[PDB]
RNA sequence: ACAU
DNA sequence: CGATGT
């Protein structure tokens, strides 16, 4: 129904899919980008949203921030639930990057708490997610 | 079909 | 048009 305006908004942004992935962090209600991720070389865009939550959980967390995420990633949003990204990407030598951040995250996920409403982004409604990469 |  | 996912 409503935005809730006083939260992150999250995105991948990739050239290729499978191909080069990255992702950043926004404040919804302004836009300001606070964090993004160096790009790597191969991956989904599944992985890419998948990552992108979960840096936002630990970015939160670190601030002791009670804000909701937002993502616009049907998948990506249950994986977390989950804690489980159930990727198709082969595990070769150069999916290996993504492959160990995602399993990374996985891992964090597994080891720590958090009570952070991860929401989805209702685009038909609202349009592009505020940390859309615009292609 | 829906979400990307 | 192609691909990633539930
Ligand atoms: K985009
Ligand atoms: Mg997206
Ligand atoms: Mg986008």
């Not at 995105?11 to 209600?29: A, F, H, L, M, R």
């Not at 191969?42 to 009670?66: D, P, Q």
């Not at 082969?90 to 996985?106: P, S």
């Amino acid at each position: 129904e409503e935005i809730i305006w006083e939260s992150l908004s999250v995105d991948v942004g990739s050239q290729g899919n499978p191909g080069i992935v990255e992702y950043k962090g926004v404040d919804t209600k302004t836009g300001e980008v606070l964090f993004e991720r160096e790009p790597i070389p191969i991956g989904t865009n599944n992985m890419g949203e998948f990552l992108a939550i979960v840096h936002g959980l630990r970015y939160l967390k670190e601030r002791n921030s009670r804000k909701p995420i937002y993502s616009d990633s049907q998948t990506a949003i249950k994986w977390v639930k989950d804690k489980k990204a159930k990727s198709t990407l082969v595990r070769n030598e150069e999916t290996a990057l993504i492959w160990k951040l995602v399993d990374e995250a996985e891992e964090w996920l597994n080891t720590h708490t958090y009570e952070t409403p991860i929401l989805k982004w209702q685009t038909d409604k609202w349009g592009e997610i505020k940390a859309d990469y615009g292609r």
